[PDB]
């Protein structure tokens, strides 16, 4: 990454926020201005800020932009929750005549009341054991923040084989939801007594558990 | 009134060809900086090609020779024929037109939604949609989609009108190659034999289109 | 039998913009080149169709010198077969150029504190120029499907666009005047010799 952005930043509502893009003298110092994107995961980017400091119709005036020697920088005042997104900034580079990007800052939105977990524990359905395969699904929904640990058991001994399990994304609610998945075959599911997730969230652990 | 709209992506053979294309309104393309940024899957944004309102091209170093910028009047519509594809090509193709008029530098004002092309010589995989019959004063159903192969995967219930406690998870990626998700509802467990709860599935690069009943057991 | 005036045009105190690039001719005159090997000052002296040295010891028909403004990263795009938006929508040279380009940094002279927004280049063309073309329009840039109607918006650009030179800019986006002098033969009886 040409241009060096902070992999993240932070900010409780109603703050502000700053994200800093350091370049050289090939580009901020060769007199290349700097721009801003924004970007949703799963979604295109857009145009936050342009030429260092302008504001495209339609971006509110609490995103500003400033460039200082071979930096340049993204404020955003009055912090809200939808900007918890990806942010980009890009110039152009003499060196290489090519326009470049910022590595990109993933901006977390803090200060919420912490939201304990919801555990619901899927065992393999009965058309998954037809196939010769089984899963062990572990739903977990509605926390803040959005940080767990889950820790799968089978009888009383701890599993680590076979453990896949996203990173939470914010539901519909703004509140987080996360899965965790353990692959078994059908024998292993029916010959132990039970299978256990155990989600870990903020030095509180809830525990679910199913059996054949 | 304006609308960048790419296609054509895929799943290609390392060393196979591709035409991507973006289909534009508002925008004459042949009067515009245009432009194509990609962006592989977790990472992070790069710039591909452009094109000058006067025909001028340039590639990005990684692509020059392999990759063709060009657009057409008739379709007013922009392309990117992408040949000798490697696996590092893997990404989001966005479609965007490009301006300097504040700056001294370019950028780009307007995107497209972007098209997925995947360089793998793993084959086509479709999913396995399996029921999670409701469990717990609410309850959660949802639907397992299984070992498919590439992304994306599309999921709605009752054909889209069902949208209330409703979450699709990102997928996973297991250690055999193939992705898996799951799609869950909250519902009412008063609602439990009441509502009928059918999840659709749709893997567009295998042409697998499933739905799937979830009842209680 | 007087001299060529090339101290006018390369000594000038005031200088084109190069959307609106300038040009003198020069005919029936001996040629002093000695002003340009015995310079010092210019960041630039590539020529083309002729041998750089053995300028003295040559004839031409006419002698035309084209003078305009640009930023010091833009320089090499005044050079036969070279793109972009300068040699696209300002000023090309054709691939026959014979000729020799010349620039030097002129920071101290075209930038100001504030910057200074006098000197322009056109930002937007439908078509690249044509080598030797001057295109000084106005017009608002249609870049949408719907016309300007003479208003300034969304899709609706003025074409010209000003360098925001400031004497701390860095070299890239510095000032260079340039002089671009075209030797052509023509059948007809020389008029510049030295
Ligand atoms: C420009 O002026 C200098 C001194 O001010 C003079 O020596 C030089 O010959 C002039 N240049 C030309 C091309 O006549």
């Given at each position: 990454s040409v241009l060096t952005q902070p992999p993240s930043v932070s900010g409780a509502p109603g703050q502000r926020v700053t994200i800093s893009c350091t370049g050289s003298s090939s580009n901020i110092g060769a007199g290349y201005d700097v721009h801003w994107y924004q970007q949703l995961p799963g979604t295109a980017p857009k145009?936050?800020?342009?030429?260092?400091?302008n504001r495209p119709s339609?971006?509110?005036?609490?995103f500003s932009g400033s460039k200082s020697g071979t930096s340049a920088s993204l404020a955003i005042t009055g912090?809200?929750?939808?900007?918890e997104t990806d942010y980009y900034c890009q110039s152009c580079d003499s060196s290489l005549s090519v326009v470049v990007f910022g590595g990109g800052t993933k901006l977390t939105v803090l200060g919420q009341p912490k939201a304990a977990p919801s555990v619901t524990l899927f065992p393999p359905s009965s058309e998954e054991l037809q196939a010769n395969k089984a899963t062990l699904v572990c739903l977990i929904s509605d926390?803040?923040?959005?940080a767990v640990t889950v820790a799968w058991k089978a009888d009383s001994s701890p599993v680590k084989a076979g453990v896949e399990t996203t990173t939470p994304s914010k539901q519909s609610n703004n509140k987080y939801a996360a899965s965790s998945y353990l692959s078994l075959t059908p024998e292993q599911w029916k010959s132990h007594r039970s299978y256990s997730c155990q989600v870990t969230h903020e030095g509180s652990t809830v525990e679910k558990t199913v059996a054949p | 009134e304006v609308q960048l709209v790419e296609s054509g992506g895929g799943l290609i053979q390392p060393g196979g060809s591709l035409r991507l294309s973006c289909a534009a309104s508002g925008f004459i393309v042949s009067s515009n900086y245009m432009s194509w940024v990609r962006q592989a899957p977790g990472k992070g944004l790069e710039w591909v090609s452009i094109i000058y309102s006067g025909g001028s091209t340039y590639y990005a170093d990684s692509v020059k020779g392999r990759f063709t910028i060009s657009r057409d009047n008739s379709n007013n519509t922009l392309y990117l024929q992408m040949?000798?594809?490697?696996?590092?090509?893997t990404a989001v193709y966005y479609c965007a037109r490009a301006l300097q008029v504040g700056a001294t530098s370019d950028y780009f004002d307007y995107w497209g939604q972007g098209t997925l092309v995947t360089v793998s010589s793993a084959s086509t995989k479709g999913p396995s949609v399996f029921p999670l019959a409701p469990s717990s004063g609410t309850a959660a159903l949802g639907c397992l989609v299984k070992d498919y192969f590439p992304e994306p995967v599309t999921v709605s219930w009752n054909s889209g009108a069902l949208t209330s406690g409703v979450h699709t998870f990102p997928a996973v990626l297991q250690s055999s190659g193939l992705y898996s998700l799951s799609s869950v509802v909250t519902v009412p467990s008063s609602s439990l034999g009441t509502q009928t709860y059918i999840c659709n599935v749709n893997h567009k690069p295998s042409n697998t289109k499933v739905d799937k009943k979830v009842e209680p057991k | 039998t007087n001299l060529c005036p090339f101290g006018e045009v390369f000594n000038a105190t005031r200088f084109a913009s190069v959307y609106a690039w300038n040009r003198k001719r020069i005919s029936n005159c001996v040629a002093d080149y000695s002003v340009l090997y015995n310079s010092?000052?210019?960041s630039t002296f590539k020529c083309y169709?002729?041998?750089?040295?053995?300028?003295?010891?040559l004839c031409f028909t006419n002698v035309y010198a084209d003078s305009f403004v640009i930023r010091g990263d833009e320089?090499?795009?005044?050079?036969?077969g070279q793109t972009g938006k300068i040699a696209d929508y300002n000023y090309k040279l054709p691939d026959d150029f014979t000729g020799c380009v010349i620039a030097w940094n002129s920071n101290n002279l075209?930038?100001?504190?504030?910057?200074?927004?006098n000197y322009l280049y056109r930002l937007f063309r439908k078509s690249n120029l044509k080598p030797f073309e001057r295109d000084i329009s106005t017009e608002i840039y249609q870049?949408?499907?719907?016309?300007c109607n003479g208003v300034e918006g969304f899709n609706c650009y003025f074409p010209l666009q000003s360098?925001?030179?400031?004497?701390?800019?860095?070299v890239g986006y510095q000032p260079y005047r340039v002089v671009v002098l075209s030797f052509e033969l023509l059948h007809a009886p020389a008029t510049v010799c030295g």
């Open positions: 145009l936050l800020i342009y030429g260092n400091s339609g971006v509110p005036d609490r912090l809200q929750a939808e900007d926390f803040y923040p959005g | 040949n000798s594809l490697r696996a590092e090509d | 010092a000052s210019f169709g002729v041998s750089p040295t053995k300028l003295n010891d320089v090499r795009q005044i050079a036969p075209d930038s100001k504190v504030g910057g200074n927004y870049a949408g499907s719907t016309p360098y925001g030179f400031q004497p701390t800019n860095g």
